Amino acid sequence: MADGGSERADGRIVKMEVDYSATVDQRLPECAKLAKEGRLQEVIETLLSLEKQTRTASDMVSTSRILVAVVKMCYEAKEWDLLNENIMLLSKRRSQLKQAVAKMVQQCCTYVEEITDLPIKLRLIDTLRMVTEGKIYVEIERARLTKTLATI
Amino acid sequence: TGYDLSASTFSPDGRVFQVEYAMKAVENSSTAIGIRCKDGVVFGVEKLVLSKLYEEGSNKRLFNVDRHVGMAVAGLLADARSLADIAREEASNFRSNFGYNIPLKHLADRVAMYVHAYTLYSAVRPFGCSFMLGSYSVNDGAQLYMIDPSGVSYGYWGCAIGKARQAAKTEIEKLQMKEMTCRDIVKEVAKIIYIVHDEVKDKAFELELSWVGELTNGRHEIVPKDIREEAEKYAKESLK
Amino acid sequence: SAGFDRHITIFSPEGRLYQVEYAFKAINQGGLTSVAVRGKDCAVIVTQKKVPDKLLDSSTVTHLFKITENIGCVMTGMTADSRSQVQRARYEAANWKYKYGYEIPVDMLCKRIADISQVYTQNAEMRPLGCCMILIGIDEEQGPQVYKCDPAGYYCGFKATAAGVKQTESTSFLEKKVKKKFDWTFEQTVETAITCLSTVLSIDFKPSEIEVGVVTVENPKFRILTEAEIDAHLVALAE
Amino acid sequence: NQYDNDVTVWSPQGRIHQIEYAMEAVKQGSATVGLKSKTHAVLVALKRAQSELAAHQKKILHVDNHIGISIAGLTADARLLCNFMRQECLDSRFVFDRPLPVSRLVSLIGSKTQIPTQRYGRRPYGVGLLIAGYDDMGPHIFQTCPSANYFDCRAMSIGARSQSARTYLERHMSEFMECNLNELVKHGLRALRETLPAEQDLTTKNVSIGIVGKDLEFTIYDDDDVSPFLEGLEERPQ
Amino acid sequence: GYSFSLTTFSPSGKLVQIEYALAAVAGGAPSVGIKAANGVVLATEKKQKSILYDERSVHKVEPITKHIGLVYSGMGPDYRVLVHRARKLAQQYYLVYQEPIPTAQLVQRVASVMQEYTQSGGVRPFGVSLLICGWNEGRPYLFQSDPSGAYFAWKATAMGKNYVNGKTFLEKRYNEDLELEDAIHTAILTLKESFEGQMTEDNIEVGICNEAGFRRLTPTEVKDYLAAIA
Amino acid sequence: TTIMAVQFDGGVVLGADSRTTTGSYIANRVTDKLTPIHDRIFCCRSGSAADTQAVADAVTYQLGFHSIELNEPPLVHTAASLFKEMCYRYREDLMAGIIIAGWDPQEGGQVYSVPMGGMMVRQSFAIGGSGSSYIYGYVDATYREGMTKEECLQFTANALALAMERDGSSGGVIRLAAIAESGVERQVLLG
């Protein structure tokens, strides 16, 4: 079902530089329409985590540079829109957004010795917006705590 | 319970049990189903023979209200006869005051408000009947309605009234009724009746199939199944 | 304690009477909730539907009822008592035009409805119609209005309105909602009318489970929203 | 027991007991048997004495020249329905100048008895009418009941201990369509003699036989003309 | 108890269901009415259960003719019946006599309407008491009907909840001769005795009688009247 | 009084004079002889003035109430039936010359005629009123099957003006109306 979205994501990671990264955001809403389907077993959470993994990996390549604003504006795009995307009335709070950003706060642990203090706290102030809502319940309950200790 | 005597009294939690008691009197009657195809409505009634002295066509439950409207009653049979005469009389005044046939959407509203009036006063009781209304037109297509003893009336694609109300609609909804013709429906109605308890713990029965749609040119009449007998020939092959 | 007047409509020693206030908990067997919102020059009804069967149709379910060309309503409570209440509303709206020669105000109609519900309390020997009615309409030199009629014969017009099962939870949301002085530009109205019902019921509904009636100063005809543009307002609030 | 008082009050089982009690008034009256052939419909009743020297109470009564009825149950509801029955028969003669079809006259009775089985203020009619008639499509045998249901049938017996009469009719109903009146009448009154205690016999003074025919007007024979019908009979196998 | 009904007596005393109907009057909203030397002042209490209720929709002080007003304390749904009765009844005098009906004449007739529902049995009495004002033939008037059918002529009174505190207030307060402007000052000051917390221009609703006819006050004056005048 | 109604392929065309007279004195000089009932159905009235105004209010009350229940636009034949049920019932009491015309989605343009008796009949074109007797020979020698809309407006303008030539119950000004699927175009013709 969603393996076509994986092999298209196999295309876009090659075409991060061959094609421009806005076209990765143009192939993105088709994978959102796949997440809009999300019915029972076909295109649901386990395969939805794969596009969520590959869209963050494309967000890694696009904003490894100092053009950081794309990974942040893609987040308030999708994390306000996921109420319209996957399942209405509090979707799952279960592997649909959690490890996609638990990887990213692990990346904020990596970049804090490399990137300077300004765009990483712009990165933190934009991830505090949805961490105040959910995603720090259990398992990685310290997705907030490993980065609010970083703010200290 | 106790405050359940009149139909004009409320319970301490807010419902009328006299309406609730009359609903499950319809439950004890035999199953009558209704279904509509894309160009017609097909009725069907499981009707059981009383002992033996029944004379093969008495006291039927497939009435004929208008030129294109009939009923598929179930419950107290005498109470349905008086209710059928109201719908015969209601459709006559619409002809005499407006000059054309009664729409089924307007006919079911006039009947259900009349059933509603017997659920308000302490002098009278609610009815003990539930029934079907099927019609066909060229400007409106086919419609199929449903009236409970309380008076709630709205439209279905298929229904059942009797003991097996749930046990019939389980296998009604596995039919592709949106595109079939109502000649293929007739051989499919007869197997729905014969699956669920035709004469298992009962004694005997006889099938009645009413019929309205494009092939009848808007007329409502019984099937010519007596001709070629194809309903029972096709449904009794479903023994295994 | 009770005893004394819990069968018929007479007084209780010092207090009130119970058969009318048993009709107030006769709405709640519908299992439904309706919300009306007046913020500015428009007016919005919103109500969910509950379809429990695939054989059951879609067109014959809607609780939005067009009374006149500029007056629409929504009905809660039990179903059969609701439609007979509408038949009186359609009837006496036409008597005003015949007797008096102009369109009836939405304020005047709830007087004529609640007075019919009044006689059934005063005089006995008829069950007092356990349903509730909410109206909207456009008035010249007065703007839009939202009215509610009660089974007791009470009526009052008010801005943000809830009914059905969840009054005390939805009105608690709308008191905190209508306290700031924000303008209501016809999508501020609808998005609050959705998200109030969406959080109190906790459904955040899929597009095909509701109804939305509307009226607006521009086109004063009563209008039921198309399923396509219901999706357009749903994708508007969740950008 | 509190639900067992009025016609209006439903039960928590869904059965109105006042209609169920008016069936019991039908079993108080005596037995009567009606049947029909292709051409002739004969109903036979059983009189009951009041005292040892009073006249026996009549059962079969003429209605129209093509309609005659039997009776079982209350005599108050008997003549009250008869006066409604005779009024409707002569209105079609006065207006339409035709005799009534038998099947649509009985539908007027079910509309007549439906109102006092729903509205408070009048009990249901305790009555057991058997109806024989001639429309344009041959003979008919009808029965009614105080639950306002009417049943078309080819043979029927109602009244006291009438179950034993029904067993005789079921194993001889194949013979009824062909035989003529010389035995069709005494096919019927062989069914009455099982609704009797086994020591007395159906005499000439306690039985009525009414015959309506295709070419025969409805005629009531009693107490003098029963003797050409009771001749040529066997006894009970005792 | 014997009661249960209206068409029979008790073995010792009086009709009990009319006494129970007066209990619903005491559980109503409070009200006050003061007859001054040049006019009569009516004032009542009107609080919504929420901030959502439009206050300018349903009114309490209700004119009958151009010189007669009327308030209540009981149930508002029963109040609207006998108001519409008193309107059409006041026009029947004017079609016959071509003269505005005096205030002592409605109370003969309105109490005879509330009389008639205390009959039969298959009916219930009202749960509303009234206060009727008006300035006919120079002298102003202030009356009070009840669900039993009797009536009065008050100098000053108060109905509704906590009426005994307002009565002992007015017994210590009301003198014989004041103007209408001093009368409203002691009519809000007795409403402050038993009101709730905030008292704005929308919590109260006040109508007056002059000799220039009946008038109810808009909230522009009532804000300016309650502005620091006690 | 002279009234006129002609149907065509799209819809119908109506027309009338004004000149409400009494004896030999004109009381009303310009008069709406055609009355809206629904958005697509008009009627033009003739006979007694107070009788036809009372009937047209009751039919608008009954038909306007009836279409809201069905949630459908009403039929033109439905409206013509309601005038028949009042004129035939209350005959020997009314003098009404009602002609009903209008567009309908099911059938298109229709013209019905209800004279002083109480009968109802569908026609292609219809005349009525006191001055209608003078143009009966002109209207059937000029009529032709298969006209357009602009021909029918030309047809009824010349047809009314011959009855409105001098005849004492007719003249004044011409009020025309065209009813189709799109809308209702009403105009006043003089000179």
From Swiss-Prot, chain A:
The chain holds residues 1 to 152 of 456 of the full protein. Component of the 26S proteasome, a multiprotein complex involved in the ATP-dependent degradation of ubiquitinated proteins. This complex plays a key role in the maintenance of protein homeostasis by removing misfolded or damaged proteins, which could impair cellular functions, and by removing proteins whose functions are no longer required. Therefore, the proteasome participates in numerous cellular processes, including cell cycle progression, apoptosis, or DNA damage repair. Belongs to the proteasome subunit p55 family. It comes from the Eukaryota. It is linked to Stankiewicz-Isidor syndrome: A neurodevelopmental disorder characterized by delayed psychomotor development, intellectual disability, behavioral disorders, mild dysmorphism, ophthalmologic anomalies, feeding difficulties, deafness, and variable congenital malformations of the cardiac and/or urogenital systems. Coiled coil: none annotated. The modification N-acetylalanine is found at residue 2. This is 26S proteasome non-ATPase regulatory subunit 12. Component of the 19S proteasome regulatory particle complex. The 26S proteasome consists of a 20S core particle (CP) and two 19S regulatory subunits (RP). The regulatory particle is made of a lid composed of 9 subunits including PSMD12, a base containing 6 ATPases and few additional components. Interacts with ERCC6. There is a cross-link at residue 92 (Glycyl lysine isopeptide (Lys-Gly) (interchain with G-Cter in SUMO1)). There is a cross-link at residue 92 (Glycyl lysine isopeptide (Lys-Gly) (interchain with G-Cter in SUMO2)).
Curated annotation (Swiss-Prot), chain B:
InterPro entries: Ntn_hydrolases_N, Proteasome_alpha, Proteasome_alpha-type, Proteasome_asu_N, Proteasome_sua/b. CDD domains: proteasome_alpha_type_3. It is found in: Cytoplasm; Nucleus. The modification Phosphoserine is found at residue 238. Keywords: Acetylation, Cytoplasm, Host-virus interaction, Nucleus, Phosphoprotein, Proteasome. It holds the Pfam family Proteasome. One of its GO terms (molecular function) is ubiquitin protein ligase binding. The modification N6-acetyllysine is found at residues 52, 201, 225. Belongs to the peptidase T1A family. This is Proteasome subunit alpha type-3. It comes from Homo sapiens.
Swiss-Prot record, chain C:
It comes from the Eukaryota. Coiled coil: none annotated. SUPFAM superfamilies: N-terminal nucleophile aminohydrolases (Ntn hydrolases) (SSF56235). It is found in: Cytoplasm; Nucleus. The modification Phosphoserine is found at residues 12, 58-59. It holds the Pfam family Proteasome. Keywords: Acetylation, Cytoplasm, Glycoprotein, Nucleus, Phosphoprotein, Proteasome. The modification N6-acetyllysine is found at residues 97, 99. The keyword Repressor does not apply. One of its GO terms (molecular function) is NF-kappaB binding. GO terms for biological process: positive regulation of canonical NF-kappaB signal transduction; proteasome-mediated ubiquitin-dependent protein catabolic process; proteolysis involved in protein catabolic process; regulation of inflammatory response. One of its GO terms (cellular component) is cytoplasm. The modification Phosphotyrosine is found at residue 154. InterPro entries: Ntn_hydrolases_N (IPR029055), Proteasome_alpha (IPR050115), Proteasome_alpha-type (IPR023332), Proteasome_asu_N (IPR000426), Proteasome_sua/b (IPR001353), Proteasome_subunit_alpha6 (IPR034642). Its main location: cytoplasm. Belongs to the peptidase T1A family. The 26S proteasome consists of a 20S proteasome core and two 19S regulatory subunits. The 20S proteasome core is a barrel-shaped complex made of 28 subunits that are arranged in four stacked rings. The two outer rings are each formed by seven alpha subunits, and the two inner rings are formed by seven beta subunits. The proteolytic activity is exerted by three beta-subunits PSMB5, PSMB6 and PSMB7. Interacts with ALKBH4. NCBIfam families: PRK03996.1. This is Proteasome subunit alpha type-6. It comes from Homo sapiens (Human). The gene is PSMA6.
From Swiss-Prot, chain D:
Keywords: Acetylation, Cytoplasm, Glycoprotein, Immunity, Isopeptide bond, Nucleus, Phosphoprotein, Proteasome, Ubl conjugation. One of its GO terms (molecular function) is lipopolysaccharide binding. The keyword Calcium does not apply. SMART domains: Proteasome_A_N. Pfam families: Proteasome, Proteasome_A_N. There is a cross-link at residues 112, 205 (Glycyl lysine isopeptide (Lys-Gly) (interchain with G-Cter in ubiquitin)). InterPro entries: Ntn_hydrolases_N (IPR029055), Proteasome_alpha (IPR050115), Proteasome_alpha-type (IPR023332), Proteasome_alpha1 (IPR035144), Proteasome_asu_N (IPR000426), Proteasome_sua/b (IPR001353). Its main location: cytoplasm. One of its GO terms (cellular component) is extracellular exosome. The modification Phosphoserine is found at residues 107, 174. Glycans are attached at residue 107. It is found in: Cytoplasm; Nucleus. Induction: Induced in breast cancer tissue (at protein level). Up-regulated in liver tumor tissues. GO terms for biological process: immune system process; negative regulation of inflammatory response to antigenic stimulus; proteasome-mediated ubiquitin-dependent protein catabolic process. Belongs to the peptidase T1A family. Component of the 20S core proteasome complex involved in the proteolytic degradation of most intracellular proteins. This complex plays numerous essential roles within the cell by associating with different regulatory particles. Associated with two 19S regulatory particles, forms the 26S proteasome and thus participates in the ATP-dependent degradation of ubiquitinated proteins. This is Proteasome subunit alpha type-1. The gene is PSMA1.
